[PDB]
Ligand SMILES: CC(C)(COP(=O)(O)OP(=O)(O)OC[C@H]1O[C@@H](n2cnc3c(N)ncnc32)[C@H](O)[C@@H]1OP(=O)(O)O)[C@@H](O)C(=O)NCCC(=O)NCCS
Ligand SMILES: NC(=O)c1ccc[n+]([C@@H]2O[C@H](COP(=O)([O-])OP(=O)(O)OC[C@H]3O[C@@H](n4cnc5c(N)ncnc54)[C@H](O)[C@@H]3O)[C@@H](O)[C@H]2O)c1
């Protein structure tokens with residue numbers, strides 16, 4: 001029943017904003033006081049989180065309004081230093097509301113862990129010997145996380161890739177494919193990969209080197225859609241139809257020119273990374289998966305798509321890797337990460353991922369709209 | 379001058395760490411007070427930085443030790459949530475010190491402003507019309523920012539690219555090449571792009587669309603070098619020669635497989651982004667420039683290089699775009715961004731950019747050395763043992779006792795903190 005529209009929110013005091021947020025969600029007094037006074041992350045907690053700590057560092061904590069995800073209103077916390085991001089997110093979310101809001105979907109929460117093996121005289125043969133015994137390897141990985149498996153996750157499969165031409169000789173690389181449920185999953189699959197490497201070595205006869213997740217998490221994709229009508233985009237100087245054509249022009253620019261794509265995709269992360277930070281997740285992992293995926297073709301291109309549908313409406317998509325957690329890393333440890341998660345209402349990590357790509361799509365739309373409607377000076 | 383070794387820093391309390399830092403830099407009591415107390419970012423400043431603000435959000439603020447840049451010791455502040463990063467960077471700086479530390483340099487701080495032109499049937503011809511009048515275009519860009527020119531910057535050149543066959547028809551893109559001095563550059567070059575847009579329209583007869591910086595800042599490069607000897611890399615299990623070979627195996631793996639390079643480059647930005655955050659700079663811009671640069675060849679690869687020199691020593695490089703500012707929005711506004719700059723001692727944006735690539739190179743070395751020896755999990759999971767305790771159902775204050783036990787048994791897993799609980 002949540003209403004995320006938040007009229008005049010942009011003009012209230014932070015206290016009145018905090019007040020209003022707590023009314024809508026039924027936030028407890030303990031929850032509200034986490035943001036009412038500075039220092040919600042005690043030094044006892046901060047000193048255990050990273051090394052050589054001498055203090056804490058604040059960034060603003062904001063809430064984007066209007067977002068609606070498969071028909072459900074959602075409030076979006078965001079932590080960033082740069083102006084205009086929150087406004088643009090909120091305004092595009094407001095336009096998206098009229099045409100159904102954002103529509104999202106996602107894959108299962110699957111992470112790859114790589115096991116690199118050098119020194120094999122017959123790596124292509126060894127690959128088949130490895131695959132043939134994958135159940136044994138899968139069983140071995142799952143012994144190290146009885147908890148994960150009890151919750152419906154765990155190692156599901158193995159794939160093997162080979163690299164014949166390398167300055168350091170031929171390389172075999174096994175991928176454990178692991179359902180990590182509500183975790184982002186890095187430590188989980190790293191333990192699994194370290195655990196299975198000796199059996200793998202025994203089968204293939206090489207020497208194991210790296211045992212490590214891949215951040216190109218292309219089995220953990222999240223998807224968002226948005227639709228905008230010409231009427232919604234009409235400005236003083238341009239018809240709504242001309243604005244749509246200009247947005248498509250800017251999109252094709254990003255699609256052919258990496259100099260533009262880098263900036264175009266930067267605007268997307270302007271919307272995603274602040275949500276990642278606000279929920280205590282690793283934003284370097286999200287950035288690396290985002291940009292590596294944008295050039296999987298060998299050409300660094302745009303993560304979003306923008307089209308005109310058969311009705312003349314502007315339709316955008318965002319599909320990308322989105323590894324995030326509700327548990328693990330620092331997401332349980334930072335009190336405000338827990339509060340961010342309560343504000344969002346998410347019950348699985350994949351639901352958080354779908355919100356992330358919705359916000360990234362909205363940020364890109366706001367960026368391109370502003371750039372396309374800016375008249376030429378004279 | 380300054381000594382960045384910080385003996386026993388890892389085991390001092392945050393307050394005693396801060397006192398030692400204060401002593402070393404001659405910080406004032408007011409300066410030290412900004413980290414000895416919560417809320418250095420006042421709400422009225424936070425509320426004016428971004429929209430819909432309802433509070434602030436803290437991340438830990440740390441200092442990495444041992445770093446040395448071109449013979450000078452430097453203290454490096456870092457803001458991040460993930461354990462092991464700061465320790466690995468300090469460790470690798472420690473090793474680098476024995477062989478001269480990090481050697482760095484950087485190019486002039488040049489950014490591209492893009493001006494996209496559509497609506498012409500002759501973009502190839504129009505490109506030559508622009509190049510013919512480039513001095514008139516550069517001169518008009520430079521009256522728009524006369525202060526910047528007195529500071530030693532400004533528009534130096536233009537280049538012009540064509541994409542004559544795109545789905546939306548032909549398309550011409552002019553790049554202004556702008557020296558932005560000590561700014562990241564976005565607003566400087568964006569203004570200049572707007573200024574030249576009607577003149578380019580008149581020259582080409584097309585319609586200008588986007589006027590915007592590029593974050594693929596490949597004319598704003600920073601460079602770091604490091605050297606490590608085999609004796610420094612020996613462990614009880616492994617010869618230092620074997621570790622160096624294992625590191626080269628790891629590097630060749632990143633060079634051929636994008637599934638590996640993504641993670642490899644991620645480990646570099648574990649080092650760089652927290653320094654960007656600590657100085658109030660835009661970390662999305664640095665990430666976009668970094669990863670897009672890693673694919674410029676048409677294959678997504680490693681930002682660092684690792685080799686064995688003729689003495690058998692491990693030598694590493696990092697050259698990448700590094701657009702950062704000492705001025706510009708959050709950097710002057712956030713009191714702790716100003717303190718970070720004071721701790722760093724940097725006098726130009728390029729000095730800061732060179733520290734960033736030194737840290738990123740050190741970070742990448744730290745991950746690879748762990749990966750090529752005992753595995754990432756041993757040292758990292760030990761420092762992660764409190765989060766594993768909290769996750770497995772501790773929190774409260776039994777966090778210290780089960781995290782202690784997890785580290786004694788060298789088995790930091792949720793399964794183990796559960797059964798210990
Ligand atoms: C984490 C790691 C530093 C543990 O150190 P170790 O192997 O047990 O070695 P040592 O205890 O001898 O420490 C050597 C140096 O590392 C640094 N260091 C190690 N642990 C540290 C800690 N808790 N805090 C601060 N600095 C630390 C120090 O500079 C130390 O020097 P010192 O002898 O003056 O104290 C090491 O395993 C590593 O570098 N792992 C890679 C971690 C990584 O890459 N993380 C990215 C995120 S996974
Ligand atoms: N290159 C990288 O991205 C990289 C590499 C190494 C480490 N890391 C770090 O790893 C950390 C995240 O690792 P993680 O996600 O495995 O967290 P974690 O290791 O802290 O916790 C994962 C464990 O939580 C348990 N768990 C409890 N409830 C669960 C639930 N509902 N769903 C799934 N698991 C549950 C599981 O037993 C799991 O093994 C981040 O701090 C990240 O920065 C990242």
Ligand SMILES: C[C@@](O)(CCO)CC(=O)[O-]
Nearest residue numbers: 263264266267367368590
């Ligand atoms: C405006 C933009 O550069 C974000 C600025 O931080 C994104 C874009 O150009 O698409």
Ligand SMILES: C[C@@](O)(CCO)CC(=O)[O-]
Nearest residue numbers: 212641642644645648745
């Ligand atoms: C350890 C690493 O994954 C960073 C962890 O955040 C980097 C790497 O694999 O090189």
